[PDB]
Design a protein around this nucleic acid. Sequence first.
RNA 1: CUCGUAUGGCGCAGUGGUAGCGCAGCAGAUUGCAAAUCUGUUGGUCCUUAGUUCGAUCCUGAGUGCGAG
RNA 2: CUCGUAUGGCGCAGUGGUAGCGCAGCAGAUUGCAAAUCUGUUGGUCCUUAGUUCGAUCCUGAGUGCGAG
Lengths: 402, 402
Amino acid sequence: SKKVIVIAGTTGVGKSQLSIQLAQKFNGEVINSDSMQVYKDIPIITNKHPLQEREGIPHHVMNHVDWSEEYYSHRFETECMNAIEDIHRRGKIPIVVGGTHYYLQTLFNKRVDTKSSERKLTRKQLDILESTDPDVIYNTLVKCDPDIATKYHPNDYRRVQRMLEIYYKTGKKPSETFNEQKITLKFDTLFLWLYSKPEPLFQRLDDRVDDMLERGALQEIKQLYEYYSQNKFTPEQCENGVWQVIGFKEFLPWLTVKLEDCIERMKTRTRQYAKRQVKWIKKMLIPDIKGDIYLLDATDLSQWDTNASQRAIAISNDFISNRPIKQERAPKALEELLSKGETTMKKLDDWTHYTCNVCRNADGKNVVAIGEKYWKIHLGSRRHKSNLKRNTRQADFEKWKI
Amino acid sequence: SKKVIVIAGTTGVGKSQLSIQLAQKFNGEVINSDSMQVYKDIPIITNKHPLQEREGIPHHVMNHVDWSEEYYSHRFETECMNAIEDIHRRGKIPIVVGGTHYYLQTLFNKRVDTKSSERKLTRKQLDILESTDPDVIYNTLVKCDPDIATKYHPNDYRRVQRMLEIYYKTGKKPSETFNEQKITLKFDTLFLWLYSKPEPLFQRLDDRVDDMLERGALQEIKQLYEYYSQNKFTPEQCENGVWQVIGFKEFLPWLTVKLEDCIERMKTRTRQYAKRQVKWIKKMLIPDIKGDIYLLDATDLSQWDTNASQRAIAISNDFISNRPIKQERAPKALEELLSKGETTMKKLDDWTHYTCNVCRNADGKNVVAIGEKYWKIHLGSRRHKSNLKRNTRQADFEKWKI
RNA sequence: CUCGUAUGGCGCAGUGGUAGCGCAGCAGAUUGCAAAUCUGUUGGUCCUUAGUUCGAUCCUGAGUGCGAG
RNA sequence: CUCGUAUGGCGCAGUGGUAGCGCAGCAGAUUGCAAAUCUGUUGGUCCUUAGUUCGAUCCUGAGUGCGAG
Ligand SMILES: CC(C)=CCSP(=O)(O)OP(=O)(O)O
Ligand SMILES: [Mg+2]
Ligand SMILES: [Mg+2]
Ligand SMILES: [Mg+2]
Ligand SMILES: [Mg+2]
Ligand SMILES: [Mg+2]
Ligand SMILES: [Mg+2]
Ligand SMILES: [Mg+2]
Ligand SMILES: [Mg+2]
Ligand SMILES: [Mg+2]
Ligand SMILES: [Mg+2]
Ligand SMILES: [Mg+2]
Ligand SMILES: [Mg+2]
Ligand SMILES: [Mg+2]
Ligand SMILES: [Mg+2]
Ligand SMILES: [Zn+2]
Ligand SMILES: [Zn+2]
């Protein structure tokens, strides 16, 4: 049927560069899937692929959102799908490329449509949602459909809230809506994972951050700060839209010697991001797609042409030719990445909540662990231990008094 | 979503016995998928699972067809699906078990519906189909939609004919109908493959055949011969319906010392069938389902409980719990069976036809190889070689002639 | 002691100029027959020996084996 | 040669009773914020030694290493 190639991988592995090659070779168009690259201008830090390097290959869902609006999942689902539709009804083959692997879920119905299902929210319902208290909205969820409330920590406000918002707009238990999902991906899809040992990658990521300021990153940072300013924006705004990007908020303290620390801070966010990306691909993506993915070793750039270009084209050629791929699916060196142990095996299955009666966090609430495995980890943590000593020792102060 | 478990494997690995265990443990019903077990009575040779061993677990699409009719794919698709539907809308979980892995294709839309698409066949069209000549129907196909005619050898009458039958009833090139298929399987399916080293299996299959006659196989063979007889049936009828079963046609020459040979002949058909089954599962099934299947070593029956029962239950448990399976998917010992080399790698990709001008078969036609790889195999075969000698040697009796 | 045969795993062809097939085996195929069907293909040097002959697996003799006497 | 400072990977607190805060690191989560966000967590015995005292990282006195006229 209608083929669709998707290139995934950590930041700085050459996804875009590969996307182009495949686009030319197989007549296709790029469909960005980068939560930040969808914003107007701000190319250097948001690291967009320069036009003079796109070989004229069309790109969609990229650099079209104004800093005034906030992009998101469903905004990507409609935009991404339209592109797919279009590129298909033109004899071309779509190639979605981005580091926001989360959005990929749209490729296999992994979401809830609360839009088409309109429903006037009640004063009562709203008052609960937009409530000042944190644990109030949770207890509400725990009440109506506790099976979903047990999969979310009572502090995960964003999500716990989301779940409740669904229980209302759909009037259907979210836990049930999930047991009735398909997850089957539409369109014959070919997932390509361009990997690279962390050590080498990190080094490149650090230099790429350096020569990124040399190309005039600060000019963009200040511009961003201009709009940021004269708009009475607080640093706590850096959790919405473009303000989330890795390249602005890091220098905020500099924009009120010191600039260096804001750079090292950026080098850290990027490094962390890269690490989190692999985690998602190994614990979220792969498991979801039953593990139908092919790896591409991009650790030794001196190579690339052999390990990436060719291998990709090889797989892609058979894929597009509506034939079963004969490729090894994973080069010996990275063969372990697709193993169950490194993937589905790490996924949390125990959800029973536990509440420590002796430990409590800065927010005053008592510690709550999820899953017996981690519940024990806590019990044996120096945190819990130390807390259990002051407690015992205190209890004794009286025993001795008698 | 709606779960559906499928137990596959060669004949005599214990599929049915396992199907029951899983049925009980997980509240489900069996849906037979054995092209022969769907016929009335004739249990011993058709090897049906005895009632006193089904723990009351309901069975569908099994032993309901009269020897007068001929079962087939679409007959299975409607029957199988109805059972799935029903079993589901009752809180139960279906468990399709059978050795006719071919039918399984219904689990992932791998067929063409020429029924719902009625179309009065033309005298001209029919005269081509039901034509006495063999290569006439082929050349017709080669004309209208040669892309499909190039994937079938000009001697594969059954199929070449079928393809043409589709081009008519649907008025759509079959080659195109395939490039427009989905193949995506409906229902969240869990494929279990119960394997067993050939050597041990064969030994059991042989004894299985022996003690099969001891339980009164001949009684069924004669009964079958009764209906067969007084019906003026010729041995060439053993290509339709029940008459295909392995246990009847083998003794036909005995039914007109000798009975022994008819038994050894049966022991051979069974052995061969088992070999062919694995081939289908490794070159057809697995590749089609992108390799989402779990192996179960059933070579050492002394075990079974550990390697089969438990492992299956383990995987099944997580499956049904709508959770990502953490099981290894393949026990070290059989780990190689799921490798690409043993699977998709063996699939024929070269379809260009080749015709040897010096070699010809008993039917008078010239040899026709498919795929350069096999085209060469022929060119170097002693057949071709020997034929090229008589040719050359004869030509030399011409140069000398002048 | 009459006579007949003796060919790749089995069952068979054939030929005076160094051999074919069926089955098994191995392999490819499979979108209404699938426990069925189609396709390709690896195995011998024609029991041993001494002769006839330009040359024998196919002729003569003998031995060895097997078969109906 | 007289003063300072030496505490988990880096940076810095600190009470007489057997140690912290920040950066990182590690891990779990993710179905309208995901370059985001929530959650859990490993690390050192406080530069070595002799005293002092019931007790020392912190108190006294040496020795080691770095900074300063
Ligand atoms: C007699 C023949 C050729 C096939 C039927 S055996 P089976 O596949 O039904 O037996 P199991 O379920 O594997 O025990
Ligand atoms: Mg590169
Ligand atoms: Mg890029
Ligand atoms: Mg703007
Ligand atoms: Mg989404
Ligand atoms: Mg991390
Ligand atoms: Mg059975
Ligand atoms: Mg075979
Ligand atoms: Mg058993
Ligand atoms: Mg031959
Ligand atoms: Mg013989
Ligand atoms: Mg002579
Ligand atoms: Mg001789
Ligand atoms: Mg931290
Ligand atoms: Mg001391
Ligand atoms: Zn605690
Ligand atoms: Zn030839």
